[PDB]
């Protein structure tokens, strides 16, 4: 893995995270590698003599990569904040052998956010409520991801015999043979495993 391939993987993860309705799989290894490279390059730039153009080149590159990393992490944070209860419930019932969806820091942040929200709602309102009505189930109040949203994608590995609208026969053509390099407009529910396995890129 050349560093260029690491940057390309970071870009692909950023773009895939931006257009996905749910919270995709964590990629903490890429984050840590990119952070380490940036940290080393900061000192490598600091040592260099002032007045050199290489300083400008390296500083511009660092500013160009830090933005992408921050945007990816910000998207993940927003998605965690919008759907904390369902994400936490899915994390509790996680089975071994399945890739994790949350880094430990994100898991702690989600726990703290849920605790803050529950404590605030309880203290402000629920205390003075009638005794019978004082329990609110956050698993049935906070919204859920809309896995039926339409997305744009570019195909990397060929897939054949893909079923469009599997639950209805109203569609005239129900079979799609995706080639390599083509782009399609289709629902997210149909092609979620393809995005998960890296065979399809959301652009």
What is the binding site for another protein (CB under 8 A)? 3-4, 7, 18-19, 31-32, 35-37, 39, 41, 50-51, 53-54, 56-61, 63-67, 69-71, 73-74, 77, 82, 105-106, 108-109, 112-113, 116-117, 120, 123-124, 140-143, 146, 148-152, 164-165, 167-168, 171, 173, 176, 182-187, 203
- State the nearest-atom distance from the C-beta of 113 to another protein, in Å: 7
- State the nearest-atom distance from the C-beta of 15 to another protein, in Å: 9
Q: Residue 160: name the closest of 174, 178, 137 by CA.
A: 178
Helix (H, G, I), strand (E, B) or coil at 163: strand
Nearer to another protein, 95 or 154 (CB): 154
For residues 42 and 62, the answer to whether their CB atoms sit within 8 Å is yes
Cα separation, 21 vs 1, in Å, equals 30
Q: Residue 150: name the closest of 202, 198, 197, 196 by CA.
A: 202
For residues 202 and 150, the answer to whether their CB atoms sit within 8 Å is no
- State the nearest-atom distance from the C-beta of 198 to another protein, in Å: 20
- State the nearest-atom distance from the C-beta of 96 to another protein, in Å: 25
């Amino acid at each position: 893995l050349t560093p260029a391939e690491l940057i390309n993987k970071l870009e692909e993860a950023w773009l895939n995270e931006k257009f996905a309705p749910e919270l995709l799989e964590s990629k903490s290894e890429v984050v840590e590698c990119v952070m380490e490279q940036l940290n080393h390059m900061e000192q490598n730039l600091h040592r260099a003599k002032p007045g050199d153009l290489k300083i400008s080149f390296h500083h511009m590159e660092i500013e160009r990569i830090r933005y992408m990393l921050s945007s990816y992490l910000r998207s993940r944070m927003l998605k965690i904040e919008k759907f904390f209860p369902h994400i936490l419930e899915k994390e509790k019932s996680r089975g071994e052998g399945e890739p994790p969806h949350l880094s430990p820091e994100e898991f702690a942040f989600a726990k703290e956010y849920m605790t803050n929200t529950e404590t605030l709602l309880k203290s402000v309102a629920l205390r003075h409520m009638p005794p019978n009505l004082q329990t609110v189930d956050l698993l049935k109040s906070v919204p859920k991801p809309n896995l039926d949203s339409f997305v744009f994608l570019r195909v990397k590995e060929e897939q054949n015999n893909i079923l469009v609208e599997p639950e209805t026969d109203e569609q005239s053509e129900y079979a799609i043979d995706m080639e390599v390099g083509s782009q399609h407009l289709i629902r997210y529910r149909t092609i979620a495993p393809l995005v998960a396995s890296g065979a399809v890129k959301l652009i």
